[PDB]
Coordinates of C-alpha atoms in Angstrom, one line a residue:
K40 CA -93.9 -0.2 -9.0
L41 CA -93.6 3.2 -9.9
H42 CA -95.3 4.8 -13.2
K43 CA -95.3 8.4 -14.6
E44 CA -98.7 10.2 -15.2
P45 CA -99.1 14.2 -16.9
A46 CA -99.9 17.1 -15.4
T47 CA -99.6 20.8 -16.4
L48 CA -97.8 24.1 -15.8
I49 CA -99.9 26.2 -13.5
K50 CA -96.4 27.8 -11.6
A51 CA -93.4 27.4 -10.2
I52 CA -93.0 28.8 -6.5
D53 CA -89.8 28.1 -5.3
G54 CA -86.7 25.6 -5.8
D55 CA -88.2 22.6 -4.8
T56 CA -92.1 23.9 -4.8
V57 CA -94.5 23.6 -8.3
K58 CA -98.4 24.1 -8.8
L59 CA -99.4 22.0 -10.9
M60 CA -102.8 20.7 -12.3
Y61 CA -102.7 17.1 -11.9
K62 CA -106.3 15.1 -12.8
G63 CA -107.9 18.0 -13.4
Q64 CA -107.1 20.3 -10.1
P65 CA -104.8 22.5 -9.2
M66 CA -102.1 21.0 -6.9
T67 CA -99.0 22.7 -5.6
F68 CA -96.1 19.4 -5.5
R69 CA -92.9 19.5 -3.1
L70 CA -89.9 17.5 -4.9
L71 CA -89.2 14.1 -3.4
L72 CA -85.8 13.8 -1.6
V73 CA -84.2 17.1 -2.3
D74 CA -83.7 20.2 -0.4
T75 CA -83.1 23.5 -2.5
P76 CA -81.7 27.1 -0.7
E77 CA -85.2 28.5 0.0
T78 CA -86.4 32.8 -1.1
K79 CA -89.4 31.9 0.9
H80 CA -88.0 30.3 4.0
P81 CA -90.2 30.9 6.9
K82 CA -87.7 31.8 9.0
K83 CA -84.4 32.8 7.1
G84 CA -86.1 34.2 4.6
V85 CA -83.2 34.6 1.0
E86 CA -80.8 31.4 1.8
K87 CA -77.4 32.0 -1.4
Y88 CA -78.2 29.9 -4.7
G89 CA -82.1 29.8 -3.5
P90 CA -82.9 32.3 -6.5
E91 CA -80.6 30.1 -8.9
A92 CA -82.3 26.9 -7.5
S93 CA -86.0 29.2 -7.7
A94 CA -84.8 29.9 -11.5
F95 CA -83.0 26.5 -13.1
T96 CA -86.7 24.5 -12.0
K97 CA -88.6 27.5 -13.1
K98 CA -86.8 27.1 -16.9
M99 CA -86.6 23.5 -16.9
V100 CA -90.2 22.9 -16.2
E101 CA -91.5 26.0 -18.2
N102 CA -89.5 25.3 -21.5
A103 CA -90.6 21.7 -21.2
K104 CA -93.2 19.9 -23.7
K105 CA -94.3 16.9 -21.5
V106 CA -94.4 16.8 -17.8
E107 CA -94.7 14.4 -15.5
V108 CA -95.4 13.2 -11.9
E109 CA -94.1 9.9 -10.1
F110 CA -95.7 9.3 -7.1
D111 CA -93.5 7.0 -4.8
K112 CA -94.6 4.0 -2.8
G113 CA -95.7 5.6 0.7
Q114 CA -97.8 8.7 1.4
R115 CA -98.7 10.7 -1.6
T116 CA -99.0 13.5 0.1
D117 CA -97.3 15.9 3.4
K118 CA -99.1 17.4 6.4
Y119 CA -99.5 20.8 4.2
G120 CA -101.0 19.4 1.4
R121 CA -97.9 19.0 -1.3
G122 CA -98.1 15.9 -3.5
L123 CA -94.4 14.3 -2.8
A124 CA -93.7 13.5 -6.3
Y125 CA -90.8 12.7 -8.5
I126 CA -91.1 15.4 -11.3
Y127 CA -90.3 14.5 -15.3
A128 CA -89.1 17.4 -17.9
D129 CA -89.4 15.4 -20.7
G130 CA -88.3 12.7 -19.5
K131 CA -85.5 13.6 -16.8
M132 CA -85.9 14.0 -13.6
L133 CA -85.9 17.5 -12.1
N134 CA -84.9 16.6 -8.5
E135 CA -81.8 14.6 -9.4
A136 CA -81.0 17.6 -12.2
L137 CA -81.0 20.3 -8.9
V138 CA -79.0 17.7 -7.2
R139 CA -76.5 17.3 -10.3
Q140 CA -75.9 21.3 -10.7
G141 CA -75.2 21.1 -6.9
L142 CA -78.3 23.7 -6.6
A143 CA -79.9 21.1 -3.8
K144 CA -78.8 18.4 -1.3
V145 CA -80.2 15.0 -1.2
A146 CA -82.8 15.5 1.9
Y147 CA -83.5 13.3 5.1
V148 CA -85.1 10.2 3.6
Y149 CA -88.2 9.2 4.5
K150 CA -88.8 4.7 3.9
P151 CA -91.1 4.1 2.0
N152 CA -90.6 7.2 0.2
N153 CA -87.0 6.2 -0.4
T154 CA -87.3 5.0 -4.7
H155 CA -84.8 6.9 -6.3
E156 CA -82.5 7.6 -3.1
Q157 CA -79.5 5.5 -4.2
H158 CA -79.7 7.7 -7.4
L159 CA -80.3 11.2 -6.2
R160 CA -76.2 10.5 -3.3
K161 CA -74.6 8.9 -6.5
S162 CA -75.8 12.8 -8.3
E163 CA -74.9 14.3 -4.9
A164 CA -71.5 13.0 -4.8
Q165 CA -70.5 14.2 -8.1
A166 CA -72.1 17.7 -7.5
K167 CA -69.7 17.5 -4.4
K168 CA -66.7 16.2 -6.6
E169 CA -66.9 18.6 -8.9
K170 CA -67.6 21.5 -6.1
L171 CA -70.6 23.1 -8.3
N172 CA -72.8 25.9 -6.2
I173 CA -73.5 25.0 -2.9
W174 CA -70.3 22.5 -2.8
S175 CA -68.0 25.9 -3.9

C-alpha cells in the first residue's frame, strides 16, 4: 500500500525531473511513468513542447502549498541515483496533470513500479482525443 510523504522544493529542472529536499537531504526525482519532451535531452537538446512541459511543472510545483512524494512498490531510485516517484502538488498528481495536458506520454512501464499506469493511460487517451499539444 502506497503512502505520501512530504517534501520541499529545491529546484524544477526539466518537465520530468525536480530536485526536492526529502528526509532532510537534497535529492533529484524523476517522475514515474511519463516522458516529457526535453530541453536538455543528452542527444537532441531542445524538443518541441520541451519548454512548455518544463514551464508547466515549474509553475505547478512553485505555486503549491504542499508537495508530497509517493514511491511505487519496486525500486525507489534509478541507475542515476534519481528517486522514482509520483509527485503531488496540493493533492493533484503532477505526473497525471502533464499527461492530461498533452505535455507527456506514458513511458515504457517496468513492473512492479506501475501502480497508477491505468489511470495515466486513461488521461493520455483523453489528451489524444482532444488533440492537445503533443497530440495536435
